[PDB]
Proliferating cell nuclear antigen
Amino acid sequence: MFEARLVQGSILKKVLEALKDLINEACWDISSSGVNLQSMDSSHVSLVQLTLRSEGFDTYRCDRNLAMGVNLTSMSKILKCAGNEDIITLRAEDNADTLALVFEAPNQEKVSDYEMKLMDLDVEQLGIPEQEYSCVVKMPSGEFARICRDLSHIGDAVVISCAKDGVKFSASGELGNGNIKLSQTSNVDKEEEAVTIEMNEPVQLTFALRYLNFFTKATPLSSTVTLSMSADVPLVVEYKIADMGHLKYYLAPKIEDEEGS
Amino acid sequence: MFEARLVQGSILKKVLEALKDLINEACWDISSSGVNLQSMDSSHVSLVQLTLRSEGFDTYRCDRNLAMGVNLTSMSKILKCAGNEDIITLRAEDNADTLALVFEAPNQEKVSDYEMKLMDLDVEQLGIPEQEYSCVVKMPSGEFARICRDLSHIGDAVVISCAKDGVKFSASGELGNGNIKLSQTSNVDKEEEAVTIEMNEPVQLTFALRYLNFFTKATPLSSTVTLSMSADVPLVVEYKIADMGHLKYYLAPKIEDEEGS
Amino acid sequence: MFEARLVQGSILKKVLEALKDLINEACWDISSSGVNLQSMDSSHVSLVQLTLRSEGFDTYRCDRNLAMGVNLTSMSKILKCAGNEDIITLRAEDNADTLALVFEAPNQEKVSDYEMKLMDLDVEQLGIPEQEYSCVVKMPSGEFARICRDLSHIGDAVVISCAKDGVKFSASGELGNGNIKLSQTSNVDKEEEAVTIEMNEPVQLTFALRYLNFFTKATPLSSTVTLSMSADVPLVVEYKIADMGHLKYYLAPKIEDEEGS
DNA sequence: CGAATTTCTAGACTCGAGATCAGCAGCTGCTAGGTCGAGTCTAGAG
DNA sequence: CTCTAGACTCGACCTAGCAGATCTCGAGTCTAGAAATTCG
C-alpha cells in the first residue's frame, strides 16, 4: 500500500516544473526505501534520474514496490494549481490504475481531492555505470542559468574549457562570437559564491545549447549546481534538493566532425 | 440633461472591464433614483443586471429619465486609457446627440475628455421574476475565482451540492475527476474570510465552466459574493458594488439531458 | 586604436534599444571631441542624430577619426546580454573590421568578452539647417509618452495647435475623436514637472503616431522632453543624455496636401 | 520581502497573396510595355 | 554654314500568360506565461 505525506509542496511543484518539458511520460518507480525516477528523452539523447528518498518524507509506507506509468503533463497541470505552501498527501491505491492526490491548507479549512488515470508503459531500465570525472566544478545556479541563457542568443553550441585559470565558456555564430570566463574564488567562504574547481587533466567538449537551457530550469530547487565530466563521456549535471535526494542530468557530448558538416 | 460625478472612477473602470466580453449592446435606463442596466447575453443563455444608486455619486441629477443604446466594447477601449485614480463627472446632453466624458486628474493639473456617439436600439424588456432560493451561500470571492479557474483545467461542467458540511465543487473531466469541498465554518469572527449557508433542501446541478470563468471576471469589485439557487431555478450570482449598489449575474442550470437512456 | 570605457552601461543599453527599431545600418564618427552619429531613417521620412561627447566617458582616447559601419539590430541583441550595472569597454583596434566589446561585473568576478564584425558603408553627409523655433516646450517625458500611447488608440493623425494656456493634442478617427488638453503651468518649484512653452506665432500641424510610437522609446534616458516646433519646419525633439550630451530626433511634419486624396 | 500589479513576449490563429498542380486545347501570334541605341535638333563657343 | 555632343523619339525587339483546385506561406492578431516593478 502506498501513502506519502509531504510538507513542502513547493518541492513537488519545482520538481514537476523542471521535469515538465524534457519528458512527457515516465515509469514512476517506487521502492520501500524511497522514490526513484529514471526515464529518457523523445529525441533519445538526454537521461534524467531522480532519487527522492523516504526519510525526508513526513509519512512513508510501501508494502510492495510498484511501478506507475503516469503522464507528466497531467501531473504538472494538476500540481501547478495547488499553492506553493500546502501539504501534499500522495497516496496510491493498490492496482487501482489511479493516483490519489490531496492538498491540505495551512489554516486547515480547505482540502483538495484529485483523481487521474494511470497509463501503462514499457519499463526500461538502464544501469548507469560509474567512473571518475577529470574536471569537477561547482558554482552558483543563478550564474549558470544566466550564462546559458546569454550564450543561447549568440550561437548554438558551447565549448566548455575547464582551464585551470577558471572555466571559460565559449560560443560562436554568424553574429560574432563570445567567451565568458570565471575565476577560482577562494577568499569568500560562502557556499552560494563558491567557484570551486577540481582538476585532473585539461578537457574540452561541446554540447547543444537548447538542452542546457532545458536543464537550467531546475534553478529554484537549489542554489548550488555541480558539474563533472571527463574524456568522451556524457555530461553530469547535479542538483541537490535539500536532503530528500538529488536530481541528476546526463548529456552526451557532441562530435567534432559534426562541426565539419 | 444628465450629470453624474463619480469620484471613484476606478469602480466603473472595473465594471466595464467585467461586462465587456459578454454583451456588446445595452440601453442604459437612467432615473433620478440612479442608473440601471439590464442586458441579456448574445447566446441567449445568461442575463446581466446592474444597479447604480443616485446617492452614491457625489453629484447626480436626471431631469427626465433617459435611455440610450451604446457600444460597450469601444467604451471599455477608451476607459482602458484612463488612470486608476482619475475623477469622472460623466455627463450627457439633453438632446440625444452624443456622449461626453470628463476625465480628470487627482492633482487638478491636467484634464482629458472624449466624445462618443450613441445608437438607438430596441428597449427589449423581459420580466425578471422574484422567488426565494432553497440554498444560498456567501463565501470569499477570491476563493470562488480560484476554484473555478482551477476546475477549468479539468472539464466543462461542475456538479454542485449544498452539503451538510459545506459545498461539493466537483467535476469529471475526460482526464480525470476532481472534488473540492469547502468546510462550512461560522465560528470565524471576521465574516469576510468566512463561508455561510442557509440549508433548506438538498440540491444538485451543473453548469458551464466557460460561463463561470466569464462570470468571475468582476472579482476585484468586492471581497464577498452571494450564490443562490433552487430546483430548476437559474443560478444567481450577486456582486456588491461597495456602496454604489449590486451587480447581479444570471445563469440557468444546465438542463439534464436524457443521456442515461 | 579606438577605446571607449563608459561606466554607466545602462546609458548605452538604453540608447541602443531606443534606436534598434528605426535604423538598420548607421555610420559611426569618432573624434577627439567625441563620438558622433547621424543617420536618416529607413523609410526616408525621419532623421536621427546622436552626439557622444568624449568628456562624458570615464576613459576615452582616439588617435585619428574613423568612419565605421555597424548594424544595430545585432547590437541590440548582443547588448541585451549585458548586465544593468556593468562597465562597457567598447573598442575598435587598428584597421581590423572587428569590434571588441568587454563587460565587467561590478564585483569583477564575471568577465564577459564578446566580438562584433563591422562592414564598410557609404558615408553620406547630410546637411542640417539650424534655425529658430516658434512652439518650443519643455515638459516631462512620461507625460508625453503616455499621451502619445493613449492617442494611438484613437487614430493615426494628431494636430497640435499649441495653446496660449497649454497644448491641444487633439486627434480623431473612425471610432470618434479625442482632444487631451494640458494646462500650461509655470508655478512649479522644481523643473521636473514644468511645462514651460515659448509662444510667438500661431502654429498647427499633423503627424503620424506610428512614427511617434517609435519616437518615444527613448523615455528611460531622461525625464525632460525639449520639443521644439516652428513654421513648416521639420519636427525636432531632443533628449538630454544625463550630462554627457543630447540625442536629437528629426521628422518632417506630414504635408496636409497629401491628405487631399 | 512577498505578493499584487503591470508589462512584455512568444506562440497559436487567421487572412491574403503567391506559388504549385492535374487537367485541358490543340495555337502560339497578338498586345502591352519596357529598354535601348541611334538619328537628330539646338545652344554655346570658336 | 557646318561639325559635334547630349536629349528625345521611333522603330525594333522581346516576352509573359492561355483556367480551376490545392496546398503553402507570410503577415497580422490575441493570449498566456514570464518578468520587472513597486509599495507597504
In short: Chain B has four helices and 18 strands.
